[PDB]
Each structure stands twice: as C-alpha cells, then as structure tokens.
Amino acid sequence: KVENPLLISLYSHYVEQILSETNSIDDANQKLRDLGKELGQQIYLNTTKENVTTREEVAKLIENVYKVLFDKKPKDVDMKTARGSVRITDDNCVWCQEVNLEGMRGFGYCEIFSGILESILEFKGVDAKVFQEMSKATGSDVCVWNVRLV
Amino acid sequence: KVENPLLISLYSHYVEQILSETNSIDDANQKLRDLGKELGQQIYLNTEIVEKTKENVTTREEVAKLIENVYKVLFDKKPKDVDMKTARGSVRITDDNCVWCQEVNLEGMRGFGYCEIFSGILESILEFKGVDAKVFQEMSKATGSDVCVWNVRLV
Ligand SMILES: [Zn+2]
Ligand SMILES: [Zn+2]
C-alpha cells in the first residue's frame, strides 16, 4: 500500500519542523526547495558526450531521473501547456502518500523534489528553476512540478 | 547498489545537522532515538505492520517474533541475528547490511550511534504492542565495526 514508510515519516518530520520555524507558506516552500538542492549531490552520487539542451532531451532526462529515484515513469511529462517549461505530473507521489492537509492550498508539501531535480539538472549542464505547481497533500488529484529552463 | 538513496541522503542530512548542534555525543544519540520514536509513533498507523503481526505481545518468543516481523516489514529482510539473552533480560539485534549507514565512513567517532533512529523506531513499536523496552545501539558500520548491533533491554 504505502511505499517507503520510513522516507515519508522522516520527511513529514522535516516538513513539520520547517512549518514551525517559518512565518509564511512562501518561505516554507523555499526552505523545502533549499533542502532538496542540498540533498541533490549525495542523491546523484548514490544512484554521454555533451550537455543536452533541447526540451525533448530535458524531458527524457527527467523521465530517466524519475525512473532512477522512484522505480517508475512519471504520470505525465508535458512540454505543451506552459511553453518554455516542462510540467511533471505524478498521481502517486511518494512524498505525500496519505497526507491530507486542510487550509493549506499554495503550500507545496513536496517541494523537496523541486530542489532535488533542480540540482540534478544543474549537474547535467541544464540551468532551471523548479517549483511545485500543485500537491495532492493540499487537495489536488495529482502532484505537479514546473521546470522552467532559464 | 545503495538501497533507498532518498532515505539515506535525508537521514545523512539530519545526522549532519544533529552533529553540528548537540552538546556531547550521547545526547546526539538521544536526539536520534527521539526522532526514531516520533517516526515509530507515526509508523504504527500507516500499516504494513498491523496486518503482519499480533496486537498483544508478551512472552520472549512473542518478542523475538515481533522484532523479526517488524524488521521484515520496514526493511524487507530479517536481521542477521536475533539473540535472546535471558540471563541478561535483553535481545541483541545484529544486521550486516543496515540501511541507515550504507557507505558511511566516520573517522574516530566510536560510541556515536549513527543508526540510533532504529532504536527509537523499535522502542516505539515494541511499546505500542505492550513491551516496555530501552533500545540503544552498541556498534555501527558507520564508525568502523563490521556490523550494526542494537540492544533491547526488556523492562
Ligand atoms: Zn506529492
Ligand atoms: Zn547502521
């Protein structure tokens, strides 16, 4: 049923602490992003000829990174809706399984992945900004992260 | 292949900051046990455990069976050794492939229980099933030993 109970419980603890420490939902989001960026290096180590540049190559690399971290492909990788960005959709996000928060729309419970993906892309020569577009933890049907190529 | 890289990296961040802040070394172990007890409190309710064990545990055989079932639920394997020390009223848990300290190599930190979070988790779970215990880590591959070992003191 629930995949990686240990990871989701430890991350729940991290989210609880950040929420208790910050003074706004915006800053909580940014702190979770920063956490993910800090972890990206170690995650990259524990897991060809020229840096990729096209959005199709970026989307393929995103699919490969998602397979490597989560043993599966993303529900959707979309290069059409937003333009200049790639939207990653997952209907069974590992981070927010069974998490139901009320009155917290706009809080990206799963922004750690924004940071992880931003750091991994940076290591591969892809400069980007990533934020969580929506989270099932706050009522959405899926989780969506927005990767903007800068 | 490092198992569970996300969990390991997040726990590596937590121990790093919990080695930058705390006073001594033993209170760092207590902070890690406390973290583990919170995680175990949360863990008994999203249930891969409730289906795979009994609600009420008392006897020594029940305790050993509970430790093995909890290990197989949380880590998808049973530990290398579960040794019941009846004359000491304890249980020694040995694991040669602990998930927490994979590829961790800390210099001159013997006595630091890098993997005490499991002490907290197990203490909370045993407690939830009616077993008053005190769990602490005796050795950790992260600090130079060949195995990780935890001690369940039964009270
Ligand atoms: Zn999510
Ligand atoms: Zn260990």
Numbering used by the authors:
A (entry chain A): 3 to 49, 55 to 157
B (entry chain C): 3 to 157
What do the authors say?
Here, we take a structural approach to assess the relatedness of these eukaryotic-like proteins in Asgard archaea, the closest known prokaryotic relatives to eukaryotes. Asgard archaea roadblock, longin and TRAPPC3 domain-containing proteins form dimers similar to those found in the eukaryotic TRAPP and Ragulator complexes. Here, we adopted an X-ray crystallography approach to compare the structures of a potential Asgard Rab small GTPase, several RBs and two TRAPPC3 proteins to their eukaryotic counterparts, with a focus on Thor and MKD1. We conclude that the emergence of these protein architectures predated eukaryogenesis, however further adaptations occurred in proto-eukaryotes to allow these proteins to regulate distinct internal membranes.
Finally, we investigated the TRAPPC3-like proteins from Thor. The crystals were pink in color indicating potential Zn2+ binding. We further analyzed the homology around the Thor-TRAPPC3 Zn2+-binding site. We found that the predicted Zn2+-binding sites and the experimentally determined sites are not completely conserved in positions of the coordinating residues, rather they appear in similar regions and appear to serve the same function in tethering the β-sheet to the D α-helix to create cavities. Interestingly, mouse TRAPPC3 has evolved to replace the Zn2+-binding site by a hydrogen bond. We speculate that Thor-TRAPPC3 may also bind small molecules, potentially being involved in ligand transport. The cavities appear to be accessible from the exterior close to the dimerization interfaces. Furthermore, we uncover structural evidence that TRAPPC3-like proteins exist in several branches of Asgard archaea and are likely to share a common ancestor gene with the V4R-like domain.
